[model samples]
Target: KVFGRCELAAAMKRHGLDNYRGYSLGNWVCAAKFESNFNTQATNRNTDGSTDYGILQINSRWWCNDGRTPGSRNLCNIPCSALLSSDITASVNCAKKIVSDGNGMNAWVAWRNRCKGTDVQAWIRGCRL
Candidate 1:
């Protein structure tokens, strides 16, 4: 699962992240960037053979119900590795929605304090096209 440049761009678009961070001089991409470097195909493996797969880093081997990847699996009721799967593009959107749903910038500020000790408004706002 290696991401190509175009694939990443598509994924970004799919998730509605339309613009780059201006203040950081393009350094800060967003939440997904902080987690996975915008690589949808990024895969991380432990020496024990456990792996982190896909955009949100879904550990399918463990997160999956039957201990299998999506293809061979049974009908997933709520999506495989939801913390890492489902519409991850939608996940960013959901987070943004939650931030904006109420409290606006203040919500983002709180999340930053807990996560990175900084305000995120300067980094992300209103999302993209």
Candidate 2:
């Protein structure tokens, strides 16, 4: 597992996500929570049989490979399991690349559904920035 909510906020700030591509840090934190409950080892197979991996729940449809998914783009070049690491370096880098690819937070359905326009201050509440 990764850090708790506040620690995650601090970590993302340390990783330069506070102003990532001019996006809100709250959205990032909220998305991660909704995606995987902060569980780095989390995995969810959707109704379409596409799997979401790790804390960000990054999809096999476009980002990473799970070997069994036929339509996987594997754009991140690393295995989907890589996102499950306790160290989030590779996952965060891939997530940054995903954000830079013109999709921004739209790449994450969790953000679209839950974090968008929500009062997300609780995501970083009490965290020392």
Candidate 3:
């Protein structure tokens, strides 16, 4: 599913992403906008043969198991395919785990480059959250 900005904002908040790690719901919304453009089925291949999956583009190298990424830790304990679902529950949960693991939102280069130090509230502007 390709969510509208407000829809994604509401969804992320519903999944407990709002202020999950001192980051606001808008911060997550902004990262998703840049990472996958709100598309649940998005994937990006890495040069190391691993892949990024889902709305937040979680990586196969250390997060999810794809059966193809060499030495995958599968720390999220989910199949990489799970991240592609529009349901987004697994994706949201894995994202939380990533943050809780002390990697912080900087685990996503997109968030560092695009969302960090920016007024991310614009990403959720006008959303009734």
Candidate 4:
């Protein structure tokens, strides 16, 4: 769904997260911010009108790739937006690719320069993610 895979790695590193584990803090952040603003109940449809479910908004209405029946998979299995996850890091990685693609730190710098938060500035100024 996106261009590349750099932001995903950086986010993981920044948060002391890892894909090899059952959960990644970076994936959580990406899931929260990327698709639904971290709202577990968030849901949206595509231009063609398909159901993009959960946070990071996995389009579960059809089998596009990654796996079959993830769309139909139980909320317990895939969970809702807040509880969602994947075995191969597809959603997290794709979401990162969509926005930052690793170079998003530059964008963050611009955001901080305009927005101007000390914490936000720290993210912009020093964070590689």
| Clash statistics: count for each candidate | 0, 0, 0, 3
Residue-wise lDDT of candidate 1 within 1-129, one digit each (tens)? 334334544555565555432122111243445446555555666455555554544444433332535343222233434435434553344434434445532333322433344553444344342
What are the lDDT scores of the predictions, listed in order? 0.42, 0.85, 0.93, 0.40
Work out the TM-score per prediction: 0.38, 0.91, 0.97, 0.34
Question: How do the residues 1-129 of candidate 4 rate in per-residue lDDT, one tens digit apiece?
Answer: 231234434644554444333333433443445455544445665565455654456554432232433344332233234324423244444434434434432322223243233232222234355
> Judged by TM-score, which candidate is best?
3
Clashing pairs in 4: 7-102, 32-38, 55-81
Task: List the candidate 3 regions with Cα displacement exceeding 4 Å.
Answer: none
Minimum summed lDDT over a 10-residue window in model 4 is located at 115-124
Writing each residue's lDDT as its tens digit, candidate 3 over 38-116 gives 9999999999999999999999999999999987789999999999998989999999999888779998899999999
Sorted by TM-score (best first), the order is: 3, 2, 1, 4
lDDT digits (tens) for residues 27-61 of candidate 2: 78998999888888999998877898888888888
Model 1, position 38: C-alpha lDDT score: 56
Residue 66 alpha-carbon offset, candidate 3, angstroms: 0.7
Ranking by lDDT: 3, 2, 1, 4
Best-fitting candidate, measured by lDDT?
Answer: 3
